[PDB]
Amino acid sequence: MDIILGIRVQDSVILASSKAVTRGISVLKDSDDKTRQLSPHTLMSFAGEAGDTVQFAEYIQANIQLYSIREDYELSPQAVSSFVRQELAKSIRSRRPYQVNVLIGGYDKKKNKPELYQIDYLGTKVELPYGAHGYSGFYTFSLLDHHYRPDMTTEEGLDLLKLCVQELEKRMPMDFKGVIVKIVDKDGIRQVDDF
Amino acid sequence: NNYDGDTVTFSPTGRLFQVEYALEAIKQGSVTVGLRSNTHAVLVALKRNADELSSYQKKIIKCDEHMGLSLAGLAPDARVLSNYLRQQCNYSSLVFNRKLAVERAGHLLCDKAQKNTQSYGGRPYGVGLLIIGYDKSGAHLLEFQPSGNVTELYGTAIGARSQGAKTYLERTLDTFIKIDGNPDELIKAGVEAISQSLRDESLTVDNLSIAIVGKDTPFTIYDGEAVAKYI
Amino acid sequence: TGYDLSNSVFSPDGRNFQVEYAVKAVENGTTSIGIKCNDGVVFAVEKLITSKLLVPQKNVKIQVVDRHIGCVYSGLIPDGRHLVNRGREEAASFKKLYKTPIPIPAFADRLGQYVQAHTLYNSVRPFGVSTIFGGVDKNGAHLYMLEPSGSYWGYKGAATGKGRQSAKAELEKLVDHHPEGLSAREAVKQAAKIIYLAHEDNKEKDFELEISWCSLSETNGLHKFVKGDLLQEAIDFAQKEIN
Amino acid sequence: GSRRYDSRTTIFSPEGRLYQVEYALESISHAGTAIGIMASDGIVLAAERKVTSTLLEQDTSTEKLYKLNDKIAVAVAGLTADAEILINTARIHAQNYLKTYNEDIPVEILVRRLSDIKQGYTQHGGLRPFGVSFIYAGYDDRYGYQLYTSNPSGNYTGWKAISVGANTSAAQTLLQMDYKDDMKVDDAIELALKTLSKTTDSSALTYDRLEFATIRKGANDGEVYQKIFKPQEIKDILVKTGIT
Amino acid sequence: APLX
Amino acid sequence: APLX
Amino acid sequence: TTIVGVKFNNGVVIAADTRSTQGPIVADKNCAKLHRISPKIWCAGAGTAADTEAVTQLIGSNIELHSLYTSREPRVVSALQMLKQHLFKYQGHIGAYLIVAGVDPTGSHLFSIHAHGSTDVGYYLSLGSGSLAAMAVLESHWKQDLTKEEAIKLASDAIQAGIWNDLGSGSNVDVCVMEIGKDAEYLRNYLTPNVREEKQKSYKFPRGTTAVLKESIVNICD
Amino acid sequence: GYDRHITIFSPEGRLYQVEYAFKATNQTNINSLAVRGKDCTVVISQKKVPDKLLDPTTVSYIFCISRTIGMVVNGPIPDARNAALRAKAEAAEFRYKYGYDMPCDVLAKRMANLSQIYTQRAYMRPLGVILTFVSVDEELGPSIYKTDPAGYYVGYKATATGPKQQEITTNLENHFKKSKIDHINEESWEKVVEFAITHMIDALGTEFSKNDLEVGVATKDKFFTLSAENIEERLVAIAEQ
Amino acid sequence: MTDRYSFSLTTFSPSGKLGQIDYALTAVKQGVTSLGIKATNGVVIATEKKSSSPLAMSETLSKVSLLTPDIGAVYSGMGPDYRVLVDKSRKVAHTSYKRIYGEYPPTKLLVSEVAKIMQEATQSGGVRPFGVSLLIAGHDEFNGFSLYQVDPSGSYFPWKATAIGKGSVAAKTFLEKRWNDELELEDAIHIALLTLKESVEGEFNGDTIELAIIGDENPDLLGYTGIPTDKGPRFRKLTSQEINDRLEAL
Amino acid sequence: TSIMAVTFKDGVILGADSRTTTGAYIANRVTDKLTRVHDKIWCCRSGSAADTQAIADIVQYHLELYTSQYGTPSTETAASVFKELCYENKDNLTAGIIVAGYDDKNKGEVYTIPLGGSVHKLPYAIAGSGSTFIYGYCDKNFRENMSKEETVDFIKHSLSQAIKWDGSSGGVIRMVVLTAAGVERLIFYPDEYEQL
Amino acid sequence: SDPSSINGGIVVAMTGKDCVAIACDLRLGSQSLGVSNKFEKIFHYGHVFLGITGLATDVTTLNEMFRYKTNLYKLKEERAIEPETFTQLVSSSLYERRFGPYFVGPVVAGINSKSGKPFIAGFDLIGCIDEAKDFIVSGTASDQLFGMCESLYEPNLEPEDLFETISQALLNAADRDALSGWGAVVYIIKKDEVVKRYLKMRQD
Ligand SMILES: [Cl-]
Numbered sequence A: 001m002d003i004i005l006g007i008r009v010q011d012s013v014i015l016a017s018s019k020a021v022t023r024g025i026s027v028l029k030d031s032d033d034k035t036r037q038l039s040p041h042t043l044m045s046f047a048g049e050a051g052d053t054v055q056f057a058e059y060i061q062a063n064i065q066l067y068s069i070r071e072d073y074e075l076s077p078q079a080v081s082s083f084v085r086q087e088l089a090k091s092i093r094s095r096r097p098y099q100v101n102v103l104i105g106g107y108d109k110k111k112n113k114p115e116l117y118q119i120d121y122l123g124t125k126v127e128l129p130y131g132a133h134g135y136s137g138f139y140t141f142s143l144l145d146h147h148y149r150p151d152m153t154t155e156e157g158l159d160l161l162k163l164c165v166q167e168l169e170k171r172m173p174m175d176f177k178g179v180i181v182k183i184v185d186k187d188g189i190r191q192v193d194d195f
Numbered sequence B: 001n002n003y004d005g006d007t008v009t010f011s012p013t014g015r016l017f018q019v020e021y022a023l024e025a026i027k028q029g030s031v032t033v034g035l036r037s038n039t040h041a042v043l044v045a046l047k048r049n050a051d052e053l054s055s056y057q058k059k060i061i062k063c064d065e066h067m068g069l070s071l072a073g074l075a076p077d078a079r080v081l082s083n084y085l086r087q088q089c090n091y092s093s094l095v096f097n098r099k100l101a102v103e104r105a106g107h108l109l110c111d112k113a114q115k116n117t118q119s120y121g122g123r124p125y126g127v128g129l130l131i132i133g134y135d136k137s138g139a140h141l142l143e144f145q146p147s148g149n150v151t152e153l154y155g156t157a158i159g160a161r162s163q164g165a166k167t168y169l170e171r172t173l174d175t176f177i178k179i180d181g182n183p184d185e186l187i188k189a190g191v192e193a194i195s196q197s198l199r200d201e202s203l204t205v206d207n208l209s210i211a212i213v214g215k216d217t218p219f220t221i222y223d224g225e226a227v228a229k230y231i
Numbered sequence C: 001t002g003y004d005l006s007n008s009v010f011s012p013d014g015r016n017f018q019v020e021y022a023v024k025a026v027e028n029g030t031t032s033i034g035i036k037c038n039d040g041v042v043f044a045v046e047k048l049i050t051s052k053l054l055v056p057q058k059n060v061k062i063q064v065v066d067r068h069i070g071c072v073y074s075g076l077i078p079d080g081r082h083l084v085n086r087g088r089e090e091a092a093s094f095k096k097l098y099k100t101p102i103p104i105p106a107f108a109d110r111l112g113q114y115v116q117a118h119t120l121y122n123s124v125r126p127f128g129v130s131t132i133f134g135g136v137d138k139n140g141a142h143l144y145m146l147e148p149s150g151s152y153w154g155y156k157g158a159a160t161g162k163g164r165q166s167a168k169a170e171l172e173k174l175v176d177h178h179p180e181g182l183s184a185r186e187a188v189k190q191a192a193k194i195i196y197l198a199h200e201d202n203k204e205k206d207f208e209l210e211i212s213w214c215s216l217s218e219t220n221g222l223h224k225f226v227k228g229d230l231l232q233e234a235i236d237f238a239q240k241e242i243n
Numbered sequence D: 001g002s003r004r005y006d007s008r009t010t011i012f013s014p015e016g017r018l019y020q021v022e023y024a025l026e027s028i029s030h031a032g033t034a035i036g037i038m039a040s041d042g043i044v045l046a047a048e049r050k051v052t053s054t055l056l057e058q059d060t061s062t063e064k065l066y067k068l069n070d071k072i073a074v075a076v077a078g079l080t081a082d083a084e085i086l087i088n089t090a091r092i093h094a095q096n097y098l099k100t101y102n103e104d105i106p107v108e109i110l111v112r113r114l115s116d117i118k119q120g121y122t123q124h125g126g127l128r129p130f131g132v133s134f135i136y137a138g139y140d141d142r143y144g145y146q147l148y149t150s151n152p153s154g155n156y157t158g159w160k161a162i163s164v165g166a167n168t169s170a171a172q173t174l175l176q177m178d179y180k181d182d183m184k185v186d187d188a189i190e191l192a193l194k195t196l197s198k199t200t201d202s203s204a205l206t207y208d209r210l211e212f213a214t215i216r217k218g219a220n221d222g223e224v225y226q227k228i229f230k231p232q233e234i235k236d237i238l239v240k241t242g243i244t
Numbered sequence E, F: 001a002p003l004x
Numbered sequence G: 001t002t003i004v005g006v007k008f009n010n011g012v013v014i015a016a017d018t019r020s021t022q023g024p025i026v027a028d029k030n031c032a033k034l035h036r037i038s039p040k041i042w043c044a045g046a047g048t049a050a051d052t053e054a055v056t057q058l059i060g061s062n063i064e065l066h067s068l069y070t071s072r073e074p075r076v077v078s079a080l081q082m083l084k085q086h087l088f089k090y091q092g093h094i095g096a097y098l099i100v101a102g103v104d105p106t107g108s109h110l111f112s113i114h115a116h117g118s119t120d121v122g123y124y125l126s127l128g129s130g131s132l133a134a135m136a137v138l139e140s141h142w143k144q145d146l147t148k149e150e151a152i153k154l155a156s157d158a159i160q161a162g163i164w165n166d167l168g169s170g171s172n173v174d175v176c177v178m179e180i181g182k183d184a185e186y187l188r189n190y191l192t193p194n195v196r197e198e199k200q201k202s203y204k205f206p207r208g209t210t211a212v213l214k215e216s217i218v219n220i221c222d
Numbered sequence H: 001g002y003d004r005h006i007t008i009f010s011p012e013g014r015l016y017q018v019e020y021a022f023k024a025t026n027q028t029n030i031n032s033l034a035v036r037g038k039d040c041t042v043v044i045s046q047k048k049v050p051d052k053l054l055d056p057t058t059v060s061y062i063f064c065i066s067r068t069i070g071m072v073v074n075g076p077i078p079d080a081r082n083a084a085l086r087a088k089a090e091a092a093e094f095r096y097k098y099g100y101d102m103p104c105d106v107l108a109k110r111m112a113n114l115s116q117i118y119t120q121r122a123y124m125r126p127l128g129v130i131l132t133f134v135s136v137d138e139e140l141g142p143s144i145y146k147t148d149p150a151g152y153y154v155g156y157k158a159t160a161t162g163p164k165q166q167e168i169t170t171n172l173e174n175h176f177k178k179s180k181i182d183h184i185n186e187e188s189w190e191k192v193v194e195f196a197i198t199h200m201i202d203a204l205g206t207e208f209s210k211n212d213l214e215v216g217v218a219t220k221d222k223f224f225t226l227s228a229e230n231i232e233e234r235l236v237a238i239a240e241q
Numbered sequence I: 001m002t003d004r005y006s007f008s009l010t011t012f013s014p015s016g017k018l019g020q021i022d023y024a025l026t027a028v029k030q031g032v033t034s035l036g037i038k039a040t041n042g043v044v045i046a047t048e049k050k051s052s053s054p055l056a057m058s059e060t061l062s063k064v065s066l067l068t069p070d071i072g073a074v075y076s077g078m079g080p081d082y083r084v085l086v087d088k089s090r091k092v093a094h095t096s097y098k099r100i101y102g103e104y105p106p107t108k109l110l111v112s113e114v115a116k117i118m119q120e121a122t123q124s125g126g127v128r129p130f131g132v133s134l135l136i137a138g139h140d141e142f143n144g145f146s147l148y149q150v151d152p153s154g155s156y157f158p159w160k161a162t163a164i165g166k167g168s169v170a171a172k173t174f175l176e177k178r179w180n181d182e183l184e185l186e187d188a189i190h191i192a193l194l195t196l197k198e199s200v201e202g203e204f205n206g207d208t209i210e211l212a213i214i215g216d217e218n219p220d221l222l223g224y225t226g227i228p229t230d231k232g233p234r235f236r237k238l239t240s241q242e243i244n245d246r247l248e249a250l
Numbered sequence J: 001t002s003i004m005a006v007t008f009k010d011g012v013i014l015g016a017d018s019r020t021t022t023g024a025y026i027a028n029r030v031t032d033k034l035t036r037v038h039d040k041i042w043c044c045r046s047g048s049a050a051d052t053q054a055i056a057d058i059v060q061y062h063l064e065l066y067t068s069q070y071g072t073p074s075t076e077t078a079a080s081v082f083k084e085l086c087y088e089n090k091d092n093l094t095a096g097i098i099v100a101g102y103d104d105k106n107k108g109e110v111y112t113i114p115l116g117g118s119v120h121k122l123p124y125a126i127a128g129s130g131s132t133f134i135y136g137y138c139d140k141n142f143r144e145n146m147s148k149e150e151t152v153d154f155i156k157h158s159l160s161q162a163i164k165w166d167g168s169s170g171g172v173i174r175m176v177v178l179t180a181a182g183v184e185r186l187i188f189y190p191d192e193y194e195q196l
Numbered sequence K: 001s002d003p004s005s006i007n008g009g010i011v012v013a014m015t016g017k018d019c020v021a022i023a024c025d026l027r028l029g030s031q032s033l034g035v036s037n038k039f040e041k042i043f044h045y046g047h048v049f050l051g052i053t054g055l056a057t058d059v060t061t062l063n064e065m066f067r068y069k070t071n072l073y074k075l076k077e078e079r080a081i082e083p084e085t086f087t088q089l090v091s092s093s094l095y096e097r098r099f100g101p102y103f104v105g106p107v108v109a110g111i112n113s114k115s116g117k118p119f120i121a122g123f124d125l126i127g128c129i130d131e132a133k134d135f136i137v138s139g140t141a142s143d144q145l146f147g148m149c150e151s152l153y154e155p156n157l158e159p160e161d162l163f164e165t166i167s168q169a170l171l172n173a174a175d176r177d178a179l180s181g182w183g184a185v186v187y188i189i190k191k192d193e194v195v196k197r198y199l200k201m202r203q204d
């Protein structure tokens, strides 16, 4: 797992997530997509304990999709994020808690605003212009504090993200095998194929 | 009449009609006979078929190396009760390294049946059983009825027209009781007893069922060509 | 009406007809008795010989509870066994917690409360037995009789079943003619006589006699069955009297 | 056993009706009439009290109209006690939704869960159904103003205007006659009271035999206000439309 | 947690 | 804790 | 904490200091460690602050219901039994150390309860971190046949020993007097021997000292 | 009419099973009576041993519930003993939970509540008994409290129960009318017992031997029953009067 | 064994009546008259202590009960049903309110809880409805004085004044003539005593009448001093003597 | 603690010191470690104060209920109820209990129940921390069928020594006398017993 | 590994003349890493204000919980919950979780709308009520807040004076704590107007 970032620009949310899956002294995989689509305008990336991450993500995805079918309606990113937080907040006092951290990036169609939520495994939720989990934040937050502007375009956002990935590839101890980038905007969710 | 809706209701003369109706399914059952000497105990059962294309329903079930029974009435109820017996015999072995007394087997069945004659929602067992065995005090034959009444006998019979055999055994008593050390003679007497209950039919090779247990014979069951010796 | 179709329902007179119907099952059964004596109790019962084929001595009907209590009953035999099984659990748990064997009055109420419990709900049926029981404890001998309603009292002598009246009359004579007390071995003989006398009222089928007793001196306060020379001797004493 | 005394509350008739639901509905038909009317700019709830005594404390009273959350209220026809059981359930259910999603519960979602509870009492558990019909009046930002009804069967439907309880046949005919889509709230207030006035089994409609509520956008800008009318406020609105 |  |  | 109980002629008196501590820090300078279980049964509590309050209210609640059910005035031994059996069930994890006292139809009573659930009877008792300072005073001055005023003095003297000599105790003395045939009198801040001296200077600031970024009116209304 | 078999209301708002439980109260054909002295509470009840085969000592309808509480039952013995065992358990538990002896009136209330439940919950039948509880309460003094199958209970100056109850009741009312007080103004319980037996004799119009009666006395700190001999001693003193 | 009655014993008939509730109300009709009157500075609740035998000591039987220090109740119908309702009502005031908020519940909410309990006896399996109607008089800081009637169905209503049981129809008429919104508490006691004589046959004195008020705080009834914000119970039972004092000036 | 119980001619006597310890601090110097579970069945308590009180309260409750149903329980029965509690809860209990009672049949009886919940019927028994120091003395000086005055002296002298050497024992010496004559409480103060 | 100081933050409350003030910082971090600069710790339920320090997930959870409980309270009681009552509800709710508590340090502030009295209170994580005339403090810089408050505070301050005092107590305490700061909010609460001011403070 390890690297997950998110930046919210003027008109979209961009999620970048590392492709490596490592167990022991072996990189088992270099094309892992650490993300699940929760609804057509909501995306969730995840990192944490092996097994727990996907099990949690798919479980949330199943619940949100059920809601969508039941009401013939898409839950707002704020609503989905609150649902997710509650699930993690319950979990933290279970017999065995989910050790998963998530970023939820969504485009709210009622407001016509992109939104990025950072939630850790304890159920600690915060809405942010840009977010990261794990050691990634220790390089990117300061970098983004410097270079980020609230009114950036999606293209400006991707260049800003190139800076973050470059820094992480320079200073991080591990080879995380690059990132898969995804954009969430008014037209839904799409994947950039050359990063 | 108004008092036969369930087992938890006495009639004004102190009867339990559901228990009596359970007793009735035994009466519709194919005949089976038990008898014993001092060295062996024998079960003979007439098996019944559906038609000429069908098998002949088994009426004898092994419970342990030293114990087993024959059934008359509802067969699934015999399966439940015989299975309980298998467990009880089993428990006696694993825990006490002790072969279960046939008398205790009797008491255990009585108490199991009785529970279903005093509580709402249940129902009495619809089957009668003849239990034979050889234990630390010799050969035994028991008669079980689903009223919970269990009775130790030298010989007996249950099912339709069992009164023929039960009369025969009543006269024959002094003879068969002293067929010691001779398996085949005790069986012959059993086969003759059951013949007193036949009507419009006689014992064929896939119709007769015999079992024997005793001093140096584990409870074993004879069917098919293995019973031709006795017809 | 319809008051008599469901256990635990009061009729307009204040009766539980289902218990009364259970009494009919008791009255329908074989005769059984108990005689209290100087330092113990004696129990006897008639076993009807349905057929030649019943193995004599081998369908025992008197039951021991713990080591010091005897129980006998008339009516539905399985119901009586169920009651004695509970009695055995009640005695075991008493001895477990309190060390001493269960006193007879204490034991009587354990059965009483359990039987009475089966007259409180429509989802159970009353017991189809009257039970005579007793033994010896630290305070002497006690004899008790317990009915389907849960009713029980202490008795000088007690009888139940088909020959209950015949037997009751016979008991009443002994109580009058032996006011200073009856010995254990006397009571054993008397018990045999009374069962033979009360067998008058049940006389198609001939019967097998069965006796037991607890006596502080004769059995050391333990319940034992009466067999061999003592049983035959008491049979003979009974045979004498019906001729 | 106890089977003897079981009415079997959850079975079908040979015609395929649920006896107890039908009989519960029959019970409700003698209850004080309640009316809901939906306008473009708000909703009205009006209901008639079961015939008053002069000594009843009428201002600190509530029998017909209950607040579920800030955006949703109900009008009751049937057993009050039965209704309160369901009302507290509905109130709790609203709060669970808010707690979970940080958004006020959509009106239909609340209505569906209550109706689902009722449905359960008709299919399992051997208990009697709730002898209650509700008119739900509420607002949410998906559908705006909404009226629904539910009844002991747990069936629910949406309405522009509807009545429950006594004389709904006459009342429904009258609403059908005078209702029109572009209606304002203040017109709907009048229609509601005029309809009760004509269907009432009393001699004349007075303030003390009524409960009244509006749900308007008539606070300040894009937000919604519930107004449960005080007795004096009903007395005024009864004059203002010339019924007294 | 305070104490007294 | 108090002992004896 | 320091707390005490002292019997006298015609009743019983309890007292307590008023300091609450969070480690070395004084969390509360004037908390009430005297609790009313019923009108004429009062409790002084040391240990885990929340536990003494919670356990005292719970048993106070059940005593009220019991008093109503029985149509009788509650007895101290009932509070004692209910408290001790509750505390025992929790194996010490509910950290309540209590001196229970009161008057009832049976007379006047004084008990202590330790958190594991053992109880003690006495004419004078003390619990808490200051219990040794207090007990030194009680063992020095207590006698058989104290008057009400002697008992009050003795009790508050014992609490004072705790206040001065124990770092776990400070501030004020609370007292409660439960006399037979009379209403309990609860004397909150009976003694106040630790009044803060006048400060040397007023630290009230020139208005506008604090730099503000934004203002806004908060909507508390509907 | 299945509203007659279980404890649900009839159209006239009645509970027939409760009413029929009251009728079972008299099944035994015994009359009981209770009075209060200055220092004591006395309860006497008729003792009828029909069968000659019974052990007369085991025939009793008076129960020692606790050291201080006694209880006499009017009704069949199985229900009576059921109620006594429960009362004994409740009184012991109360002492353990609350650290003082259960008062007579509180026990009466508790047993009454239990009876009330049987009148409301369908699966339980009422007990066909009336329970008269007696003690010398440490707060209230001599006490008599009585429970019935309806779950009703109340305290009494004195009371009686059974088929010929009304005779005894009016007999006692007429005494208290005359005496002008709440109780038997007598020092010793021996004489209060004598009063109790005497007024039972007048009201029933019958004489008693020592084996026709059964007596329970409650004093401060013990309740006890009398032997045949303590009663004989008492019958003798009434005769020399 | 155990309760196999898990189905409702109260069900709708084809006409829509719930039989057992109707029949329970009939039991209340049979019951002795009780009433309550609401004054401007208090509430009074009263009933007849109709004794079973004159050997009974009827002070030991309390028909008017304290629920909280500011709330009292009286009933008409079946006494034993009332007794266990009071037990349950007292307890629920604590468990579902005082143990949560550290203060006693307001009248309407305690009433609401009692109503819930009575409603459940109307729908739960294996039980019959309660055979009583209650009148609950109470005070709380934000609602002031209030009077409620609770019926076997679980329904409750606020009243200025009302009566229940035997002679309720007559007594309700009497109260319509006399009640106004300016009654001072003493006037309400007086009217209650007049209304009650109509329906009482035999003796009419302070030993056969049970009567309580919700009025001023009673510091003398508190049991302790030193907390000046605790001022004492507003509920007070009038003594035998207090009633007789008001019967001579009748 | 120091505790003991001694059978003699007319019955049995229980004895104990009065010290409750909370560390090396004496939490109570006038404790009553002798405890009634029935009119003439008493126990001496040692170990945890909370455990032994909780146990004795339960036993008193059982025997009160026993009494109601079956009359006066034997001393053996009382000891059995203590055992059942101590044995079945041996992991969670620190209770060393001596049970002593007077029947009219059985005269005086003493049962000691150490930590594991075993039962031991003895002529006399000693227990508690202070008992270690008087095994020698008590074994040398005990005889059967002593008089009341001899038995009081034996207990007084024994506990005097236990208190002298054991820091966890002290205060007054309490005794409870159990005979046909009833129940007698004795107390002896330091100035008497110390200089014996 | 100490849940009460993973995220950091502080809350302080003070009484004045017919007013109360309650203030908090805006930091939410994960140990050394500052994560959010907008994490407010003060909430209101009608006119009753609640500040919560400690583990941020529990802060959020408890806010959601007390909104729930006060909403139902309002519906049933037909009035807004008062501070004295809310204080009791907070206490009950925390002690209900006695052996698995929320790792929080709540603070209640508001004016009773019947009596007009200003009211403040503080709690430990398991529900112990600390009522005070003067000030209540909470969070990772509580030692510092105690020091600032005990010296700066004086009774009966006017709202605009009280504002300066509480702000200076917060700011200077926050600056001596590594885990508190990153912004601050101060609520001045009078009987029926409430002003909310964001303070300018050092961003390190
Ligand atoms: Cl109760």
Ligand SMILES: [Cl-]
Residues within 6 Å of the ligand: G118, G119, J020, J031, J032, J033, J049, J053
């Ligand atoms: Cl101790």
Ligand SMILES: [Mg+2]
Residues within 6 Å of the ligand: K203, K204
């Ligand atoms: Mg920094």
